[PDB]
Amino acid sequence: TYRNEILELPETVAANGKFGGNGVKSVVGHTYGAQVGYIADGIFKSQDEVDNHATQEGAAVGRIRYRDIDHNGVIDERDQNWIYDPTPSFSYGLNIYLE
């Protein structure tokens, strides 16, 4: 097992996010290649659910419901968080030889 982290990085590299963050948030302090995206809280199943959820463009019945991270009542590009970590918890192998 191992843990990876980026401690310092040039400002333009952090901004364009070639090493992670998708250009939305700086990868500094996070795993190499980590990505930032929305959070999918299931799908809408009724107009009541659509109305009760925080307002978002294109919401309808059967569409994906995105969590309101900042509790502002509206879903936008600020409602994103670290969702992907390309580092396994642990990798193992086993070789068995019978004669």
């Binding site: 809280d41 299931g42 107009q47 109305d51 009760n52 959820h53 307002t55 419901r65």
Partner: protein, 497 residues
């Protein structure tokens, strides 16, 4: 995942509601919109198999009017039968299908439907509108009779104006087919007689029209002791459903024989405002129901009524005809629709801005007083009684009325003008349209609004019927306002289902 529920009951702030793709009470298929209805009573199944045209917002270029049917035995529950009459080919005369009628012949046990094929980009020598017929053995599958082509120019009638074949059988057993055509520049309702619905004889002109207008989807029927002709006005300025009355068929025909203009009542035979069109009736033997379509609004805006004429197609609305002792006709809520609403919602006040006072369940409003109630729901039934000080008051009911709502959409019952007016209040001050009705002499009004999502029908003391398309109305507060007189409201009840 955790779902958060907002406090709908307790907040009067305006909210952005949305409409489902399909309606239940005022039927609307999940795909497309309903156009001109075609009511029909099945003598076998003992139900209403109302048929219609399936319109689409991006209509194809040439072949755009598929026909769909729906069974609504009660008048409130609608189950769709799918497509029945497929639109013809591009080059065929029935590329687009107009309104028609339907009869059942027990002689051969066959359902015959008559419709109007519209030729696409017709030439000078080609008839623009031709009446055709399709036959069914069980009302499930239909075969168009390719040998029938009733041309308008054959009997001296207009080539481009030959629409709405209405079918009815008299007591003697002969069948009559009525066409709203044009003869030598005049609106003529022409009649064709038959005894087997395969060969027709032109029985001259059944009736003439008034002031060179045009009548859409005519329908002749009998109600107890009177013969009525219901029709829809094609004129852009009017664009509303009217009717004519007569003791006998001969009396009805002699009515407005040469611009006589014998109106059935003081309101020129008006039945509903511009939000109701192509009204056509049918009976089950005990009740008479008229079906029409409430139009949609361009850019789903209540204020965008649309100049010249409103939009086409919309939501299928069923009302119950009310025949009075003098022969006058009015529209009433169907019994099934009334009884569908079961759950009762408590009402409460959210705003106190005018000089109004609250005394238990009875409220009193003066000049400029307005009271705002709690939110509505997707289906609503609002019933109350209003007593005015005199017979010249201006009270009104406003929907989409939030605390912060810049503009709300109101219906004002103006007694001085003796009518109702659908207008846009708030920061537009725009007058949309109106509807005339008889003012009660006791200054009493029994207001009942039945609303399905975005289509609301208002009934005033069994006398006035008023259809409206009000988006954002569901899940929003509604208010009562007074402008010139003094009013007293009581017995406010809100029911949902």
């Amino acid at each position: 995942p955790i779902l958060t529920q907002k406090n709908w009951d307790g907040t009067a702030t305006y909210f952005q509601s949305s409409d489902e793709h399909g309606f239940s009470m005022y039927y609307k298929p999940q795909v497309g919109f309903v156009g001109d209805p075609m009511p029909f009573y099945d003598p076998v199944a003992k139900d209403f198999k109302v048929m219609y045209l399936q319109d689409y917002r991006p209509n194809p270029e040439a072949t755009y009017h598929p026909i769909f049917g729906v069974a609504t035995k009660d008048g409130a529950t609608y189950e769709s039968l799918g497509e029945l009459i497929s639109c013809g080919g591009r080059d065929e005369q029935d590329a687009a299908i107009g309104t028609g009628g339907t009869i059942y012949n027990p002689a051969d046990k066959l359902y015959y439907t008559f419709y109007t094929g519209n030729k696409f980009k017709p030439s000078s020598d080609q008839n623009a509108q031709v009446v055709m017929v399709a036959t069914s053995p069980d009302f499930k599958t239909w075969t168009k009779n390719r040998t029938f082509y009733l041309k308008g120019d054959t009997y001296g009638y207009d080539k481009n104006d030959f629409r709405d074949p209405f079918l009815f059988q008299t007591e003697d057993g002969v069948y009559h087919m009525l066409i709203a055509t044009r003869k030598n520049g005049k609106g003529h309702i022409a009649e064709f007689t038959s005894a087997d619905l395969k060969e027709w004889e032109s029985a001259g002109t059944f009736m003439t029209m008034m002031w060179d207008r045009f009548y859409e989807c005519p329908d002749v029927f009998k109600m107890g002791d009177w013969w009525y002709l219901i029709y829809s006005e094609q004129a852009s300025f009017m664009r509303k459903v009217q009717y004519f009355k007569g003791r006998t068929l001969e009396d009805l025909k002699a009515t407005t024989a040469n611009d006589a203009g014998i109106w059935p009542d003081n309101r020129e035979g008006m039945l509903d405002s511009r939000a109701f069109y192509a009204g056509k009736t049918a009976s089950d033997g005990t009740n008479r129901y008229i079906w029409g379509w409430c139009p949609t609004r361009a850019g789903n805006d209540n204020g965008n009524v649309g100049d010249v004429e409103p939009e086409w197609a919309g939501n299928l609305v069923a009302q119950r005809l009310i025949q009075h002792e003098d022969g006058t006709l009015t529209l009433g809520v169907p019994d099934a629709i009334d009884r569908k609403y079961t759950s009762a919602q408590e009402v409460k006040v959210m705003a106190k801005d005018g000089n109004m006072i609250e005394s238990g369940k009875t409220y009193t409003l003066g000049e400029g007083a307005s009271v705002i109630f709690n939110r509505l729901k997707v289906h609503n039934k609002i019933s109350f009684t209003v007593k005015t000080a005199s017979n010249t008051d201006r009270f009104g009911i406003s929907f989409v009325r939030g605390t912060d709502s810049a503009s709300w959409y109101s219906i004002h019952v103006n007694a001085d003008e003796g009518k109702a007016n659908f207008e846009k209040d708030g920061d537009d001050a725009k007058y949309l349209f109106d509807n005339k009705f008889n003012i009660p002499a006791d200054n009493e009004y029994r207001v009942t609004i039945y609303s399905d999502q975005s289509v609301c029908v208002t009934y005033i003391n069994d006398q006035l019927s008023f259809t409206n398309r009000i988006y954002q109305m569901q899940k929003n507060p509604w208010s009562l306002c007074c402008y010139k007189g003094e009013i007293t409201v009581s017995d406010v009840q809100v029911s949902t289902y």
